[PDB]
Design a protein around this ligand. Structure first.
Ligand SMILES: Nc1ncnc2c1ncn2[C@@H]1O[C@H](COP(=O)(O)OP(=O)(O)O)[C@@H](O)[C@H]1O
Ligand SMILES: [Cl-]
Ligand SMILES: [Cl-]
Ligand SMILES: [Cl-]
Ligand SMILES: [Cl-]
Ligand SMILES: [Mg+2]
Ligand SMILES: [Zn+2]
Length: 527
């Protein structure tokens, strides 16, 4: 059966479920798929829930824990993710606990007693997968609790960690198949955002489950406005553009500015502070006292904007973030989706504005050089930024492999423009004449040196007679070059230097298509 057969408040527990939702959790209604998942697990069946980060996966096992006898075991990979949860539950008046590496002899002792104590109101126990594999004592206590009918539910957070395709894999998650082998009458719930069908199909094998429900929430957030603007060359013109949004459309409202590095974040904060904005900086090197100060003041609306690196992300659930601005592009669409998805968690209209700058390609490419598919993921993001016709949601859905109604909620859906295919081939030939000459001279060209030569500027040795750049503005030339880069007519070449990795361009793998003199390279332009 499908999720629809389960979107129902017909069950013996439904009265109790609505009541605990509204009066213990202080939530009013269920988000998509939350009711259905709760129903399945309450019915004592196995279910995987696939739902975006910050969407409310946890509810789907915390709420059942309260509607059942005994405790729910929660397997969770990071102590910080566990500590996130326990803070929230204590504040709700819920008895929950965790066991840990650095766990007290007194505390471990107390937990063990509670598990077999028939009168316990302790309803959730969080543990790391190390506890299942490397604690004989804890497994026997689970066995006793299971036999005493006090252990009826297993939640495995981050269930994708089970698989050999899932890029946050953890060896101890391979041991977790012991849970359903030993405790077949404990129902299991698997939660993840990052779920491919063959990573899930595999985790289902690792966990020794079959059969299983799989519920997938759409990663579409209908209230989010998605935009890409040209990033300005001048860094002071860029600040002025930001301050005009913040003091105009986002006047009084909460938001985030995401930055490439810690220096960018520190710079942008100061820049805005001097211009009146209540801006605060958040990066990893910050004294953790100040990490909290900034989060505290931002969540409490004293600071209007956090100017941050990706390090501001884990466990952000502030509901009224009205804008996420990307000062630089993310490393990948997956990072973009997740970072911008921190906007508008109250489901009211919120803005996602990405500033695309040519230079950022190379700062990021260089930075992710050691990653298998780093460059390939960056280029997908660049291709999003380069798109001027296609719906932003359509481009995102192509990436998550979802079947997929924007209703004018992205910059490209609101355009009235027409478009056409401009043949830019000769421009590619011309830049390859420049690079060919450069190698015949044993010269390395950074992207700046390529653009300068094309434009008839820069060092005179690096110029090729009869090559004229068009009188298009620079960002247009930059876009033509980014196009050939991601299309691989050109390619990057890295150099590792004492302190930094830097990028140079070269004739890339697809330049041999230009041996065909009829070959055509086209780029979409406005009519
Ligand atoms: N039905 C709901 N209505 C409103 N807020 C919710 C609902 N369900 C969950 N939340 C909130 O959403 C936020 C993120 O939930 P969480 O379970 O931590 O997300 P995930 O594990 O999917 O990242 C939390 O602040 C949580 O309290
Ligand atoms: Cl996500
Ligand atoms: Cl928050
Ligand atoms: Cl077209
Ligand atoms: Cl195109
Ligand atoms: Mg979660
Ligand atoms: Zn759209």
């Amino acid at each position: 059966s499908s999720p629809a057969a389960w979107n129902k408040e017909d069950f013996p527990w439904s009265g109790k479920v609505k009541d605990i939702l509204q009066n213990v959790f202080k939530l009013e209604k269920f988000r998509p798929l939350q009711l259905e998942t709760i129903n399945v697990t309450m019915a004592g069946k196995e279910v995987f829930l696939v739902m975006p980060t910050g969407g409310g996966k946890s509810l789907c096992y915390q709420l059942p824990a309260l509607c059942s006898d005994g405790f729910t075991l929660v397997i969770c990979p990071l102590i910080s993710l566990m500590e996130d949860q326990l803070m929230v539950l204590k504040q709700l008046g819920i008895s929950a606990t965790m066991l840990n590496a650095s766990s007290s002899k007194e505390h471990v002792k107390w937990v063990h007693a509670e598990m077999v104590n028939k009168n316990s109101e302790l309803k959730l126990i969080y543990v790391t997968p190390e506890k299942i594999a490397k604690s004989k004592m804890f497994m026997s206590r689970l066995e006793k609790a299971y036999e005493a009918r006090r252990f009826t539910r297993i939640a495995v957070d981050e269930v994708h960690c089970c698989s050999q395709w899932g890029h946050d894999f953890r060896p101890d998650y391979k041991a977790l198949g012991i849970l359903k082998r030993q405790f077949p009458n404990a129902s299991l719930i698997g939660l993840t955002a990052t779920a491919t069908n063959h990573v899930l199909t595999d985790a289902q094998k690792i966990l020794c489950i079959e059969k299983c429900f799989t519920f997938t929430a759409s990663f579409n957030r209908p209230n989010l406005y998605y935009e890409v603007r040209q990033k300005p060359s001048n860094t002071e013109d860029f600040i002025e553009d930001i301050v005009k949004l913040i003091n105009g459309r986002y006047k009084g409202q909460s938001g985030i500015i995401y930055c490439f590095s810690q220096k960018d974040s520190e710079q942008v904060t100061v820049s805005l502070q001097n211009l009146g904005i209540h801006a605060g900086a958040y990066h990893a090197n910050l004294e953790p006292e100040d990490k909290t100060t900034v989060h505290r003041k931002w969540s409490a609306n004293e600071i209007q904007v956090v100017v941050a690196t990706v390090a501001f992300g884990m466990g952000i659930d502030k509901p009224d973030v009205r804008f996420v601005i990307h000062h630089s592009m993310s490393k990948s669409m997956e990072n973009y989706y997740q970072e911008s998805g921190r906007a508008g968690r109250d489901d009211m209209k919120a803005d996602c504005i990405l500033y695309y700058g040519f230079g950022d390609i190379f700062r990021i490419s260089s930075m992710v050089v050691m990653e298998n598919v780093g460059q390939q993921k960056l280029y997908e993001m660049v291709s999003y930024c380069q798109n001027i016709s296609k719906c932003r949601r359509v481009l995102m859905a192509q990436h998550f492999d979802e079947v997929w109604a924007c209703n004018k909620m992205c910059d490209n859906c609101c355009k009235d423009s027409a478009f056409e295919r401009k043949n830019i081939t000769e421009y590619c030939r011309d830049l390859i004449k420049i690079l060919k000459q450069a190698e015949e001279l044993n010269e390395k060209l950074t992207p700046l040196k390529l653009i300068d030569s094309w434009m008839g500027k820069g060092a005179a040795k690096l110029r090729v007679a009869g090559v004229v750049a068009p009188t298009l503005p620079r960002e247009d030339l930059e876009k033509i070059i980014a196009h050939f880069l991601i299309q691989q007519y050109l390619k990057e070449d890295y150099s590792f230097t004492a302190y930094a990795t830097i990028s140079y361009l070269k004739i890339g793998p697809k330049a041999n298509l230009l041996n065909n003199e009829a070959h055509a390279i086209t780029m979409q332009v406005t009519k």
